[PDB]
Amino acid sequence: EAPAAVVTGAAKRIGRAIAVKLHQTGYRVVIHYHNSAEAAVSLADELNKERSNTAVVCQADLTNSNVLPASCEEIINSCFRAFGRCDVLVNNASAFYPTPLVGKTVETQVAELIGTNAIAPFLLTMSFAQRQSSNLSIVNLCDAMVDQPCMAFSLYNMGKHALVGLTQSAALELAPYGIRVNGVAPGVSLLPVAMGEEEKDKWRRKVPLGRREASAEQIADAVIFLVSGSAQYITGSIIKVDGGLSLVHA
Amino acid sequence: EAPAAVVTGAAKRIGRAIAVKLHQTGYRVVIHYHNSAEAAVSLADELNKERSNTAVVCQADLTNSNVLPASCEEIINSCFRAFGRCDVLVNNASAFYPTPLVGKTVETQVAELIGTNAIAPFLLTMSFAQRQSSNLSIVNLCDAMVDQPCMAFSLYNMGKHALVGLTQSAALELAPYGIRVNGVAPGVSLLPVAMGEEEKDKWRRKVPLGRREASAEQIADAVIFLVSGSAQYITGSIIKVDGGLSLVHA
Amino acid sequence: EAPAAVVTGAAKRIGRAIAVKLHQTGYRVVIHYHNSAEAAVSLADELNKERSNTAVVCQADLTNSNVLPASCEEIINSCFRAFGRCDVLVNNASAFYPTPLVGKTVETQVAELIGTNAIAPFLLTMSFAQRQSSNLSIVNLCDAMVDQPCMAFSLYNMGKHALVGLTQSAALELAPYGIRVNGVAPGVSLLPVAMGEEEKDKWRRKVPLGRREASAEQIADAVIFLVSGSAQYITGSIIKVDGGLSLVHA
Amino acid sequence: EAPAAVVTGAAKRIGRAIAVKLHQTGYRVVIHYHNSAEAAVSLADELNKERSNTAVVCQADLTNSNVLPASCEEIINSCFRAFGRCDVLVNNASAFYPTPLVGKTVETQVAELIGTNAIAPFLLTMSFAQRQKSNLSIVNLCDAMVDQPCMAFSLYNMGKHALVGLTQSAALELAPYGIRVNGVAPGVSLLPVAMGEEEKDKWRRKVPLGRREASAEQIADAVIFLVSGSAQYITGSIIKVDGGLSLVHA
Numbered sequence A, B, C: 001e002a003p004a005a006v007v008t009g010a011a012k013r014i015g016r017a018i019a020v021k022l023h024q025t026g027y028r029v030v031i032h033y034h035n036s037a038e039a040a041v042s043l044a045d046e047l048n049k050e051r052s053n054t055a056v057v058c059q060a061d062l063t064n065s066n067v068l069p070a071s072c073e074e075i076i077n078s079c080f081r082a083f084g085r086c087d088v089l090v091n092n093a094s095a096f097y098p099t100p101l102v103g104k105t106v107e108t109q110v111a112e113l114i115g116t117n118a119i120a121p122f123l124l125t126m127s128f129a130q131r132q133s134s135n136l137s138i139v140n141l142c143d144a145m146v147d148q149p150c151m152a153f154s155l156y157n158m159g160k161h162a163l164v165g166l167t168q169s170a171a172l173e174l175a176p177y178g179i180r181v182n183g184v185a186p187g188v189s190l191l192p193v194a195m196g197e198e199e200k201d202k203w204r205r206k207v208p209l210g211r212r213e214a215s216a217e218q219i220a221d222a223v224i225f226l227v228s229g230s231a232q233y234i235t236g237s238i239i240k241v242d243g244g245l246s247l248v249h250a
Numbered sequence D: 001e002a003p004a005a006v007v008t009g010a011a012k013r014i015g016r017a018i019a020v021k022l023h024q025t026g027y028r029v030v031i032h033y034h035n036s037a038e039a040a041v042s043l044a045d046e047l048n049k050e051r052s053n054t055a056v057v058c059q060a061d062l063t064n065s066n067v068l069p070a071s072c073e074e075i076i077n078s079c080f081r082a083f084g085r086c087d088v089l090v091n092n093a094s095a096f097y098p099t100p101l102v103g104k105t106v107e108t109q110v111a112e113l114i115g116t117n118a119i120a121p122f123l124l125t126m127s128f129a130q131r132q133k134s135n136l137s138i139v140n141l142c143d144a145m146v147d148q149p150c151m152a153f154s155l156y157n158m159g160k161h162a163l164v165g166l167t168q169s170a171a172l173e174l175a176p177y178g179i180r181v182n183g184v185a186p187g188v189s190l191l192p193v194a195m196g197e198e199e200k201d202k203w204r205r206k207v208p209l210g211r212r213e214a215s216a217e218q219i220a221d222a223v224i225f226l227v228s229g230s231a232q233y234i235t236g237s238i239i240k241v242d243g244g245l246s247l248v249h250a
């Protein structure tokens, strides 16, 4: 019987690339999404054409709130409902925007940035563990630049640092259950179409390895390694996939 | 005119030592507290008996909620209303208890642990910066053991990692205003007197330097250095005060 | 045609497992060794029996001295002599023994521990670089416990820290050549066969994931990943393969 | 009776500033130097004019070699011979020049960069500890930028990483003797007066806190803190004194 994986924020970009690689490797997938309903269903369709009844969608807001634990529990539940098991959780969904210290209220900024980058991963990790020759693991999408943060992104950066802490704490606590918990830390990966090509090229020129951003596939390759039998002794590790960006001084 | 400082969780233990030592150095202090009202007031009395009009109290819950930004704005405002300035912020208040992955609801555990240790510090930082020759700084009480966390303390450890992120991010962002942002990271300090003799001895025996915990005053000494004119180029630094504990393998 | 790899200290234990996996993946290998001539010759024989003239041996002391640069240059030369190319360098050889601060002279201890763990890697890196679809990379065998070092192993730990610095520096500097430079950081692996099982068990008991040391093959799996086409944007990254050991407090 | 300190590379720049501040604090000092004889003697003269019999010079090359351990032993011995005690060691002396991977021989580059920055500190630390076999401590001058190194400075960076390892290993091992071991990590400080102005300003512009380099006295300030009675529980800590430089992404 095929194993199953939940990928958060999997309608597009890096999360989709990860869901696709897992599905190709043989996983059944839960494609979680928030607003990108069309994209999520379109991916589920593609994947189901390849192999029937191997993909489902699950909509959830991962903003912090008093019902977030319920939402996270329901994401894990949807994998068990659809596939009878949940082997892998990938925490990929992430809000990202500036929150300067000097339209959204600060309450909202705190809830969205901390919720998606840290608290939801924690609550998904709880639910994944509680609901349990298998190879169970969790992969967190971290950030290679967490110690050299973008100006005015404090809440986003706090969230990513907390996700490091969770990766470590959960690796330690879930080790007795056979559940490995690791991370992948992109540098600069999929640049948005809508960026001034002046601005995209400015990020690209910063990367020592090729003067280019990582492809989604390159990030997903590291995820697939960590979930593989080739990483059976690896837990609490964060693999940077940054082309050396984080090594470059100002 | 004397500079003024806000110390959160200052009614006892390490926060009290930090308030006392700042006061001894010449600061006027706002004693923030949550439940320890009698000890907060008694400290204020003692400090005011020493120099008139140099200490006030400000009560607030720093649990995460939709009213926390206002609570944090009021803590900073209390310094201005009393003393007409606010030169130093010390983020010391902290909830600490286990939150296993497998009475409080999980949403309360998240609000308390992430609120006190990370979000409140962030909102207090926003309010402090927004209100601003001078020697302005912020000191965050971090944790020397953040990469080797206690078993079953994921949320606390998440909060403390986030606080590292805030320290770095706010140092970078506030440096143009001349506001330094640093941290002090205790190991083990002030073991609860009701913790077991076996359990205390076990922690003490692990500390390389002197096989004993730090006094509150030793933690406060590092805070004082960071706020002083002897640390005028220091920003985004976290000083461990741990007797070498974090260096000891399992 | 087939790529070629140099593995230092490859006659036994982890280095041998690395050379065998590389070979199995289709690499031709230089098997470098120092004292273990029988094991190195025998390993080359076994691999050549599998595919004709796909392995060679090369002896060299990698102790620091005035002839170490020529020695290292000759190891890289030996790969080109045998195979006309050198795509991968794995810095695995390592002296490991205590050097207390309070029958070898201290200058010999310095020379062996810093030579094998850092200086020889740097010199090999230079010679490798100087000689250069393509997929070139270096993997350095680091140590997951470098920040929580064994008591009285200062010189070893200094060497391993130096090796981290080389991994970063060389990743930055060799990126323009498309040479990636990464590390693998074992926790406890392949405990000495001669170590009593009861001492083996003291280390084993520390490991959260499975209360077991890593196999040589598990270490080798991380090396294989890093040299593979699935790691082509990864440079300056150190992958811990430690079962959570470095996460455990004293 | 006054305590005594050895400061290596103390004739000029940051070491000189550290020796001066230690002397103003009440220490007698050994001013170690290599080539800057006139500067060293001029400094000793000036400190002795302030307090008779409180400063000596000690010449030694700290390049790695088979006699480096005897040279390091003689430096420590010079302090006991002049003052009858040695309370503080500051490892400040440092060779700094590029060593690219692709007039000095490489043997010499290795001996100078690894000797001065790492091996001499280790040997001096041994001789220090053995002569003690009060508030005894060691301060190592580290580098805030060691994870974002200068292009083509691999050996210097390996040296400085090794020095972090020494700081940690020695703090752990010397703690039972009451000897604390810490570091101060400058970012950019005291630019060579002769460095081109455009290059000076290129570095200055990078620093968030004031867009300027640290003064030598600001670096000394943090050394003075670490040797003081206000840092009695601090060991194995490295204090960055960098104006936020290390926080800035490429």
Ligand SMILES: NC(=O)c1ccc[n+]([C@@H]2O[C@H](COP(=O)([O-])OP(=O)(O)OC[C@H]3O[C@@H](n4cnc5c(N)ncnc54)[C@H](OP(=O)(O)O)[C@@H]3O)[C@@H](O)[C@H]2O)c1
Pocket (backbone or CB within 6 Å): A008, A009, A010, A011, A012, A013, A014, A015, A032, A033, A034, A035, A036, A037, A060, A061, A062, A063, A091, A092, A093, A094, A095, A096, A112, A116, A141, A142, A143, A144, A185, A186, A187, A188, A189, A190
């Ligand atoms: N791209 C990079 O260069 C880079 C760099 C560093 C780290 N990373 C990390 O790698 C991961 C993937 O990066 P990316 O660029 O692919 O991510 P992204 O496009 O910015 O976001 C991924 C998904 O997060 C989901 N999301 C956003 N807010 C949400 C909310 N409130 N509730 C639930 N889901 C929400 C969105 O789902 P819908 O579209 O369905 O609404 C979005 O498609 C992230 O964790 C990111 O931080 C990426």
Ligand SMILES: NC(=O)c1ccc[n+]([C@@H]2O[C@H](COP(=O)([O-])OP(=O)(O)OC[C@H]3O[C@@H](n4cnc5c(N)ncnc54)[C@H](OP(=O)(O)O)[C@@H]3O)[C@@H](O)[C@H]2O)c1
Pocket (backbone or CB within 6 Å): B008, B009, B010, B011, B012, B013, B014, B015, B032, B033, B034, B035, B036, B037, B060, B061, B062, B063, B091, B092, B093, B094, B095, B096, B112, B116, B141, B142, B143, B144, B185, B186, B187, B188, B189, B190
């Ligand atoms: N003690 C150690 O060994 C150690 C180790 C690592 C880090 N630290 C850090 O050093 C700092 C001080 O340590 P500590 O042991 O002195 O702290 P603590 O005694 O555990 O807590 C300090 C204060 O935090 C306040 N607090 C708790 N929950 C709160 C809430 N919901 N809202 C507002 N305030 C709240 C409490 O105020 P009331 O008493 O007024 O309710 C309490 O007095 C903390 O940040 C801690 O994490 C300490």
Ligand SMILES: NC(=O)c1ccc[n+]([C@@H]2O[C@H](COP(=O)([O-])OP(=O)(O)OC[C@H]3O[C@@H](n4cnc5c(N)ncnc54)[C@H](OP(=O)(O)O)[C@@H]3O)[C@@H](O)[C@H]2O)c1
Pocket (backbone or CB within 6 Å): C008, C009, C010, C011, C012, C013, C014, C015, C032, C033, C034, C035, C036, C037, C060, C061, C062, C063, C091, C092, C093, C094, C095, C096, C112, C116, C141, C142, C143, C144, C185, C186, C187, C188, C189, C190, C191
């Ligand atoms: N085993 C662990 O748990 C562990 C933990 C952390 C890091 N690591 C690292 O992973 C790598 C492999 O570990 P291991 O346990 O397999 O290593 P090892 O058996 O201790 O050493 C590997 C080889 O290093 C070679 N070597 C030693 N001194 C040398 C010298 N002066 N010149 C040239 N070669 C020399 C030896 O070659 P000959 O036998 O031919 O003389 C030896 O077989 C090492 O870098 C090690 O530090 C291992």
Ligand SMILES: NC(=O)c1ccc[n+]([C@@H]2O[C@H](COP(=O)([O-])OP(=O)(O)OC[C@H]3O[C@@H](n4cnc5c(N)ncnc54)[C@H](OP(=O)(O)O)[C@@H]3O)[C@@H](O)[C@H]2O)c1
Pocket (backbone or CB within 6 Å): D008, D009, D010, D011, D012, D013, D014, D015, D032, D033, D034, D035, D036, D037, D060, D061, D062, D063, D091, D092, D093, D094, D095, D096, D112, D116, D141, D142, D143, D144, D185, D186, D187, D188, D189, D190, D191
């Ligand atoms: N300046 C900065 O911005 C900066 C940045 C990061 C770290 N640091 C660290 O802070 C410390 C002081 O920096 P600095 O700029 O003042 O240092 P520096 O001027 O570059 O070097 C200090 C002294 O090192 C001594 N030295 C060099 N080679 C030697 C050898 N082979 N044997 C013995 N002594 C030798 C020299 O003594 P003689 O003059 O007597 O020959 C020199 O005066 C160093 O450890 C440095 O790495 C400085």
Ligand SMILES: Nc1nc(N)c2c(-c3ccccc3)c(-c3ccccc3)[nH]c2n1
Pocket (backbone or CB within 6 Å): A093, A094, A095, A096, A143, A145, A150, A187, A188, A189, A190, A191, A192, A203
């Ligand atoms: N959820 C999410 N989405 C993103 N698009 C990013 C990015 C990012 C930022 C700039 C260019 C490309 C990607 C980054 C990022 C952060 C710091 C440095 C580089 C990229 N983090 C992101 N997280």
Ligand SMILES: Nc1nc(N)c2c(-c3ccccc3)c(-c3ccccc3)[nH]c2n1
Pocket (backbone or CB within 6 Å): B093, B094, B095, B096, B143, B145, B149, B150, B187, B188, B189, B190, B191, B192, B203
């Ligand atoms: N707010 C708060 N209060 C505390 N009492 C602690 C402690 C702590 C944990 C054990 C003994 C003494 C102190 C710790 C702690 C955490 C990790 C390792 C060691 C101590 N953190 C704390 N935070």
Ligand SMILES: Nc1nc(N)c2c(-c3ccccc3)c(-c3ccccc3)[nH]c2n1
Pocket (backbone or CB within 6 Å): C093, C094, C095, C096, C143, C145, C149, C150, C187, C188, C189, C190, C191, C192, C203
């Ligand atoms: N070259 C070499 N050989 C080794 N055998 C080791 C070890 C080591 C240490 C203890 C048990 C097994 C292996 C370790 C090691 C170091 C620090 C913590 C744990 C293991 N490093 C080694 N390096």
Ligand SMILES: Nc1nc(N)c2c(-c3ccccc3)c(-c3ccccc3)[nH]c2n1
Pocket (backbone or CB within 6 Å): D093, D094, D095, D096, D143, D145, D150, D187, D188, D189, D190, D191, D192, D203
């Ligand atoms: N012994 C020694 N001397 C030095 N002059 C430096 C410097 C340095 C590099 C550039 C400007 C000013 C100082 C640096 C340095 C290194 C990396 C980043 C920034 C400064 N390290 C030094 N070490």
